[PDB]
């Protein structure tokens, strides 16, 4: 179609499959293996990207151009890498990925949404879709085209450090929340074939259903461990939301570090090729987790030659190396040259990668849109996060006896009130893991409103608000307070650091609640990624709210405390009486919860 130097794959009017096949046919082995290689920005340079024909870059947790970087700085970084990739012989644009898992959370000033467990409490898939939409905008504000979300793990044991990344222990709730996908990517057309990838265009991002499969089913909630369950159970609990993801055109699937009945997912041909590709008809690309192929072996990295063979033969398409790319490319090249990995396998991997790139418009818009920068931290998105935080809250108790006046909602006008606890004025703590840093952090790490700040913004001007992080009993009794709001809970964590066999909150937390509630009527706000031992907190408190990890918009909490809205959240997980009961999930034989899945008290708006 019509100039003399015409190249079909560069023609935006041509069908995606025609463009894919036209480009594939022109590629060298080096160019093909390059496409299959994803590297950290930390090891990327223009020469590296060009010389190795690199297909993808990522920012892992906390991998940022600098602390406090603006949206424009991110765009300029991504564009710099893209300019190198576009300078190769074939000019294949790279795709840049990041964990935008509760907003564009590595980025300073990005709206931080509640983590997934709290989103499960909302039972509101349309809310989650709108969060996906807002997240896509804030990711594109930074020039990034690809989000490693949603985590559709079904966490079956809250001792797991990623339980907060799971919408629920109930697969039906996880299935419902796959609405994140068309939020991130755009809605698929009416004709759409389940398993095809889809992204609407330059204001949307490629999504990633992760981590395939059974990441939430590991023994004792040990992160990356073995999931011991028969096929029927894997298919009934851990797999269903992957089919919903196929139906919604999820562009990519990331493989789990975990094993199923002793077989590493990163080496499981039956599940990756036999099931995901051949049965579910997935036609996007399958990506490893970071050093996932290394961890096939024990010790990890002890036979990288085998790691490459096993993973690529299993059906993985793109390898999140993410650092030692030279070794990866060299070994894979050697395996192909020696006939150990057939060219058909390479061509399939590259077909899938290119399919996603062409489909999403990446060849047409390889560079960032500077007009999108202002989407970052946009007030409308914060208003959405505030709605989500409020809807996520689960009221567990509202009065010590059935005959007491209900404490909540609290009055906005009172002479003097107390706000207390380690989590009352700590933005990092209310965001939890995957916020600015990989593991999260403490204090004022980004733009947001803490619980204290939200209280001050809510109350009548005549209301005096006193803050004390850890007041003693005498301070509270002598203070002339009308009531107190006390916020305590878990510190930020991610992945194995969050694995926890005792699930008791750090001190001081309970001691502060006891001191405050002993002196004045108190509403306890519990910040956690999961159910934790809660009977002692309940015994002390007039009212208690499970607020999960509500994100940057602390006014979501006070919107419910002061009755602007009624409490509506319902537990998306079983609340255990004791960790000795675990695992214990709804539908089990000996089900003996402190609070069952679905429990939640309500209030009416005042
Ligand atoms: C300890 O090394 C750090 O690990 C984290 C998490 S591993 C892996 O990372 C993927 C890409 O960021 C996530 O999509 C996936 O869910 C995680 O399991 C990694 O983010 C850091 O880059 C790395 O320093
Ligand atoms: C399949 C798997 O990951 N199994 C691991 C095992 O290798 C390790 O010794 C144990 C204790 O850390 O945790 C589990
Ligand atoms: C009272 C108690 O057991 N606390 C421990 C804590 O020291 C540890 O950091 C955490 C991580 O697993 O587990 C819990
Ligand atoms: C404390 C309170 O107002 N509770 C009410 C409940 O009695 C009523 O049935 C419902 C619908 O009006 O709203 C809520």
Author numbering: -3 to 602
Task: Quote the study that presented this structure, word for word.
In the barley β-d-glucan glucohydrolase, a glycoside hydrolase family 3 (GH3) enzyme, the Trp286/Trp434 clamp ensures β-d-glucosides binding, which is fundamental for substrate hydrolysis during plant growth and development. HvExoI folds into a two-domain structure consisting of an (α/β)8 barrel (domain 1) and an (α/β)6 sandwich (domain 2) with a 13 Å-deep active site pocket embracing the subsites −1 and +1, positioned at the interface between the two domains. HvExoI catalyses the hydrolytic removal of nonreducing glucose (Glc) moiety from a broad spectrum of poly- and oligomeric β-d-glucosides. The crucial role of substrate binding in HvExoI implies a pair of the aromatic Trp286 and Trp434 residues that form a clamp at the +1 subsite, which is positioned next to a pocket-shaped site at the −1 subsite, housing the Asp285 and Glu491 catalysts.
G6SG-OMe bound tightly to native and WT recombinant HvExoI with the respective Ki values of 0.1 ×10−3 M and 0.2 ×10−3 M, hinting that this thio-analogue should be observed in the active sites of WT and mutants. This is what we indeed observed in WT, and the W286A, W286Y, W286F, W434A, W434F, W434H, and W434Y mutants, where well-defined electron density maps of G6SG-OMe and tight H-bond networks that were formed through eight to ten residues (Asp95, Lys206, His207, Arg158, Tyr253, Asp285, Arg291, Glu491, Trp286, and Trp434). We noted that the quality of the G6SG-OMe electron density map slightly declined in W286Y but that these maps were well-formed in W286A and W286F, suggesting that in the W286Y mutant the process of ligand-binding in (or near) the active site may have been perturbed. While the Glc moieties of G6SG at the −1 subsite were oriented nearly identically in WT and mutant structures, the position of the Glc moiety at the +1 subsite varied – it was identical in WT and W286A, while in W434A it was rotated by 120° through the x-axis. Our findings suggest that although the mutations of Trp286 to Ala and His led to folded but inactive enzymes, enzyme activity retention is more sensitive to alterations of Trp286 than Trp434, likely due to the proximity of Trp286 to Asp285, the catalytic nucleophile.
